Design a protein around this nucleic acid. Structure first.
Length: 77
RNA sequence: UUGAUGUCACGGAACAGGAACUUGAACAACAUCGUUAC
């Protein structure tokens, strides 16, 4: 159920936090040796959030504060 | 592009003053990855 008439805008802080999270996901030293068990961010080497793709998020009062690509991922301060 | 009866231009050092300097132990422990079940 894609609800209409309920959309929020992305400030600069959320974008730089997502960029930092992607940089942490990509160049990890402790990763899995195979290139098939990793997630979609680490396998296909995503660098920025594109036009349309499904992202988990959390907002308050029409402004979003954080966005994560999977269910249980890491949080940046 | 000169004009004649008169040119010391070999008659004149591009010369004189300014610190590539200041700051930095080749050192080191806690995880990484996401969902399962009613």
């Amino acid at each position: 159920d894609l609800k209409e008439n309920e959309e929020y805008e992305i400030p600069e802080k959320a974008r730089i936090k997502y960029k930092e999270l992607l940089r942490v996901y990509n160049n990890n030293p402790q990763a899995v040796p195979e290139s098939v068990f990793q997630s979609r961010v680490a396998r296909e080497n995503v660098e920025k959030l594109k036009s349309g793709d499904l992202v988990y998020f959390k907002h308050n009062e029409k402004y979003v504060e954080d966005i994560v690509p999977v269910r249980i991922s890491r949080t940046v301060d």
